Design a protein around this ligand. Sequence first.
Ligand SMILES: NC(=O)c1ccc[n+]([C@@H]2O[C@H](COP(=O)([O-])OP(=O)(O)OC[C@H]3O[C@@H](n4cnc5c(N)ncnc54)[C@H](O)[C@@H]3O)[C@@H](O)[C@H]2O)c1
Ligand SMILES: NC(=O)c1ccc[n+]([C@@H]2O[C@H](COP(=O)([O-])OP(=O)(O)OC[C@H]3O[C@@H](n4cnc5c(N)ncnc54)[C@H](O)[C@@H]3O)[C@@H](O)[C@H]2O)c1
Ligand SMILES: NC(=O)c1ccc[n+]([C@@H]2O[C@H](COP(=O)([O-])OP(=O)(O)OC[C@H]3O[C@@H](n4cnc5c(N)ncnc54)[C@H](O)[C@@H]3O)[C@@H](O)[C@H]2O)c1
Ligand SMILES: NC(=O)c1ccc[n+]([C@@H]2O[C@H](COP(=O)([O-])OP(=O)(O)OC[C@H]3O[C@@H](n4cnc5c(N)ncnc54)[C@H](O)[C@@H]3O)[C@@H](O)[C@H]2O)c1
Lengths: 334, 334, 334, 334
Amino acid sequence: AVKVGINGFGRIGRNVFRAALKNPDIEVVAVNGLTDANTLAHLLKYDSVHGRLDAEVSVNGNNLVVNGKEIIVKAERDPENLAWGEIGVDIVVESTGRFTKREDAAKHLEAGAKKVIISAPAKNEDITIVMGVNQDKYDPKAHHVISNASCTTNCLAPFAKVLHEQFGIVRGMMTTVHSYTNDQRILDASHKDLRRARAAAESIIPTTTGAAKAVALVLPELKGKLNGMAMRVPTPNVSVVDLVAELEKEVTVEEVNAALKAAAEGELKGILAYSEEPLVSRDYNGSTVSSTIDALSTMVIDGKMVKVVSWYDNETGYSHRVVDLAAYIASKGL
Amino acid sequence: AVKVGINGFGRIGRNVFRAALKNPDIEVVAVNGLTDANTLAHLLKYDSVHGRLDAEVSVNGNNLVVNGKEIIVKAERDPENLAWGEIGVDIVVESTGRFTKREDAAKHLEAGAKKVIISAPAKNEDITIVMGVNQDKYDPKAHHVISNASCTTNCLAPFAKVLHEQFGIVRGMMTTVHSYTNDQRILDASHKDLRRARAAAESIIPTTTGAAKAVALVLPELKGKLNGMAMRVPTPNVSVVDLVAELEKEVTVEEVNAALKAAAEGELKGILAYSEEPLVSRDYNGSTVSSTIDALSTMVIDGKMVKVVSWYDNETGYSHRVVDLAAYIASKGL
Amino acid sequence: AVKVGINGFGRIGRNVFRAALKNPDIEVVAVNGLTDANTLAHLLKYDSVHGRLDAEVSVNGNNLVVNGKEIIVKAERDPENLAWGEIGVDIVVESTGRFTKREDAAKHLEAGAKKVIISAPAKNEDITIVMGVNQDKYDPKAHHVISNASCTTNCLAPFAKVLHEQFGIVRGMMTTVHSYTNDQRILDASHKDLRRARAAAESIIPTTTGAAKAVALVLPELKGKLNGMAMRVPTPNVSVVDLVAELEKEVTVEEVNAALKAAAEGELKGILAYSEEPLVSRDYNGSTVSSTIDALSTMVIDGKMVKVVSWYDNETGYSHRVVDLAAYIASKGL
Amino acid sequence: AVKVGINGFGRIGRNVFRAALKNPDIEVVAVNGLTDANTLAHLLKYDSVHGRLDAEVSVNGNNLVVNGKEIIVKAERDPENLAWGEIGVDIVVESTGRFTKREDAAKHLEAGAKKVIISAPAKNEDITIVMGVNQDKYDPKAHHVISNASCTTNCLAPFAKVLHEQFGIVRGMMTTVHSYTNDQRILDASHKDLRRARAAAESIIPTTTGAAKAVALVLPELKGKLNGMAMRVPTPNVSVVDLVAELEKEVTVEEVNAALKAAAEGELKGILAYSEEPLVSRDYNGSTVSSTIDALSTMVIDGKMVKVVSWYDNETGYSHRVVDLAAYIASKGL
Ligand SMILES: NC(=O)c1ccc[n+]([C@@H]2O[C@H](COP(=O)([O-])OP(=O)(O)OC[C@H]3O[C@@H](n4cnc5c(N)ncnc54)[C@H](O)[C@@H]3O)[C@@H](O)[C@H]2O)c1
Ligand SMILES: NC(=O)c1ccc[n+]([C@@H]2O[C@H](COP(=O)([O-])OP(=O)(O)OC[C@H]3O[C@@H](n4cnc5c(N)ncnc54)[C@H](O)[C@@H]3O)[C@@H](O)[C@H]2O)c1
Ligand SMILES: NC(=O)c1ccc[n+]([C@@H]2O[C@H](COP(=O)([O-])OP(=O)(O)OC[C@H]3O[C@@H](n4cnc5c(N)ncnc54)[C@H](O)[C@@H]3O)[C@@H](O)[C@H]2O)c1
Ligand SMILES: NC(=O)c1ccc[n+]([C@@H]2O[C@H](COP(=O)([O-])OP(=O)(O)OC[C@H]3O[C@@H](n4cnc5c(N)ncnc54)[C@H](O)[C@@H]3O)[C@@H](O)[C@H]2O)c1
């Protein structure tokens, strides 16, 4: 229904595309990339992590054709030149990684679009949303440049929401054992971050994350109560959050796991899942939820310090929330 | 001086050997595997993780020859048939992973050996020692079957001891992001642990660890205060401990780090180390210390909750401690 | 209709089961594995390479319940005590890798099975068959212990036949760049093959193969004409055969590719495949055919020497052939 | 004594530096890299593939200090502005991979350098040199812009020479099972070559190589007689050349190997090596020769079709050859 345009046809850009194909409410009519249609059609058809796309893909001139629909393929390095308005695009997904500042992201609006969803933490954005935690704070009038936050923040926020409301989080540290991303290096090569400068598939690479501090933008109550780090490991996709926290009310594994299970079956259904199976990272590849509690790993010490471990396919889960936010925004009035 | 024999020439058995070539106090006189000397020689000479052994290694008859020294090669499934006494073996490193219970390890004593060091967490052992922490508890008269604990416990106990004495741990949780071991499966196969049954090099595998609570054996004061889990990831060697503890005092990163830095250059020298460089797992391959604090990762919330991350070569560090333990015990009198 | 029993529920045994779920002509009624039903049900449901089973799996007592049908689980180490005839088993897929010699494979016949299909090269078998190549040489009266050859031979024979019938192979060499299998070690440990003894996911490991010479069994004319080797690399599944041969006729890349494409759409349809896309191994994980020509890699020098490269998912393609054989056998008259 | 400058401080640049430390004839006095002195010292100190550098590496101002010797650090995107002349730099190693046409490389000479060695195949270079094969064709007057060829070409030419001079090569094919390099993608992303566009550590990736044809540049009698392909696989370093050739003279496995062993011990000593041990790729990491014959893999069919497999550390072997070339050139007067 609502026309959408994607800027930056990379891992997130192509994954939001795949997720958007089976969504009746949105319609991607134009993509922007810094490469030819043929290369784009090839990368969309074949995926090393997600397999072949369940649709017929072809190239008509400089345009792609997916399941009969022709997709306009642009090659504008400068956002203000995209001309979204002329082709009817109401919402633009900004996933290049270059326009995270509201100043830069707003150019899409100069170009004619009505709303911009930055697929990453932003700077000066009108609002940051985490489907399931604060999408209710969205106002169609005061918010145009929106951030969907990071994949880590999307996994952590839903369950921190439940533990906090139910027992009260006093403070806590987190660690995400994350698969490698395109921001790293294949072999030792220059990087602003000396850890990420190192061969990705060869080591356990400790790095920084702002996802912990970022939860506060969606859960104000937790401001100053959380912090954490990342550890990038040799897997191509799927990551896990490991939260250790001091609760206010004394709990038991039994209690904690029931509260999460209840939320997964009720309120947060679709966003938070609950598992009592002893699965591993490969098993989570392709899951569309943002967070899945590994129930078998939940533990407590002295009734007040808990450990909760949650899985998340960083590409697929996040891509589904971008598509979800877009459909939610459209419903709010475009 | 002390003549040592090794039961089970595997990853740990072979590294204990390599570590022993160094210490002149000890002398390996025989090894027992379940294969021919030719195979043992090769595996000793070429290592996929630590490189070629720098020494003259050959096969003489059915014995190993390393830098002129003939090493006896046995192939006894039953330790009761090892006859250590015949060949004068004073101490035996039990590294098969099959005889961790007092009932099986003791067979080495029955065969003529004076002391047994179990290269793993044991059962019904006279004592469990972690060098740098409780070797002082060693009684030559009473202790004959001694456990050298696990690679993780050897990493954790040393710095936890320092945080406890200095600030007092109220309670804490840990996660060890661990390289895979021979205990896992190369491709999906049967295993007592359904997590470890999965292809080791393809996923992040949550698995339990007893190392956290096994700390109370060496630092009794900490019984019931710590707990934790493990996560096996696609790397052949080197692991990291991630400890989040609730302290009794208010501290700063500068304080916590200054404490760990003081211990490393002082009392725990050679066992505990301190690092301010932003390194990755491959950089600690070959590290002989037990624990190396990653200063750059030290974090604190409310001045009470702390995050300390420490590295350890699981094969090298651990194997050096076995050799250390063997020379200490020997010095106490055999 | 036909009742099949699988001996050894490993990588090949489980995939054969999966493939069989498709075929209604066959019906797997019993499996034998040296583990409990619960572990078999887990390993069957979650696969690190092939994903989750698209079927409802559960355990009822000591049995497997899959899609309502109850599968009998056995735990007999000795084939003699399997009593296949007691349970109606007509065909037995021998996939343990321990009974490839006639003396052991036949024990199934003696236990009541009418036919045995060995999922690997055999010794003293009645006939070695590669579907599409020589299945017509199957005499239901004379043949009871049948070998289905190796995954490699299965990949090479269908197109080696075509190149030969059309151009005539003088002599040729082949190398298969193969994924690692459960026969290798995760870390340096004992093995009869000192190459396969090394850390699987860390090196390119040359090893031997009999596939090249084994083509002679299904294509008698090529005896003494081919030979080859293997190179095990750090990928979990999917391999590729690289053939270099001298031909009788002087050809061109279009001629060679045209003949290979023709067979793909004709005689060898379903067994041999043709591809002109620039794909990679991960793209072939899941392919049911035995061989797929990477057309873009075909090369010729002097018009007489040719290079052909063919892909094969060593687990899926082979397991589909096993089920294809079981079905062809049943139809011939059991 | 011959002052050398390295243009481009990556895998080859840093490795030429390390090799250079062991050479008496040359002395690296300056390095141009598009990054700060701090980042370069870190990347030079810690290598994920070759380990820690055994030398004191520090940074004084914008310069590097390695074992008391200071190195000038530059950050010039444009070669013309490097001013090699002002600092006594005679030879310049061009290892950026950007300036391979004689036209671009020559900018170095304009900037004061006297000689340029391109660490890669070039376009219009004055001469291409494979040490041990044709360095005698170098002329100090007429050749100023020299190409050192590719790592694959340096591995193949030394033994191609021996096989040709000894038995006569009619024609042949080769495949190099090659480790990945910085030209590949961490995760599916754009690239000229759609195969190198795919996640490097996840698949067996076929690709093209001009190494076979390039042998004709240094071995003219071999023009149009060889061709081949490459296959990138999940290993960070060490590669192997698989050569299948039709010989002129009838031979035997023994003659071929005795021939390669002889060259290894004689004329090609230092360039070609001979191994009768069943090793794996990790065992060749750090190897300084250009090519090591895996003797156990030599195969012959109809006494005419041979197969030789040779190992090469694409970074170390090649880097040493660059240092040898630079020193060879220097001995010829500058
Ligand atoms: N990779 C993940 O796991 C993940 C998950 C959640 C969020 N993100 C965020 O998504 C964004 C993109 O990340 P990714 O991982 O998909 O990376 P990627 O490198 O695969 O995607 C970037 C794409 O944008 C394109 N591009 C860059 N600048 C452009 C420009 N100026 N004009 C047009 N196209 C441009 C690039 O060519 C590329 O195709 C980042 O902000 C990232 O942090 C990544
Ligand atoms: N590898 C590590 O990181 C590590 C670290 C610390 C402690 N450990 C412990 O050390 C033990 C050995 O572990 P590993 O990782 O070296 O494994 P491994 O599999 O490499 O070593 C086991 C060796 O013992 C041999 N063996 C088995 N039974 C034997 C017998 N009955 N008699 C003689 N030899 C026999 C096996 O063939 C193998 O060679 C385990 O208990 C393990 O928990 C391992
Ligand atoms: N995996 C492939 O790529 C592939 C392809 C073609 C042929 N093969 C052949 O398939 C056979 C199986 O190979 P795999 O890769 O599946 O191995 P695998 O190790 O995964 O499975 C073999 C199974 O046999 C079981 N087993 C062992 N002894 C048994 C016994 N006596 N009775 C019952 N069960 C027993 C084991 O528990 C194991 O689960 C081998 O002969 C192999 O050569 C493998
Ligand atoms: N990687 C190997 O195994 C290998 C082996 C033999 C030959 N080569 C060749 O050597 C060359 C370098 O390859 P590499 O593997 O070192 O890759 P790399 O990416 O590690 O090295 C390239 C370096 O040059 C720098 N650079 C780029 N433009 C520059 C410029 N304009 N001025 C100054 N510095 C610049 C880059 O920042 C980078 O550090 C290539 O041509 C490659 O084909 C590579």
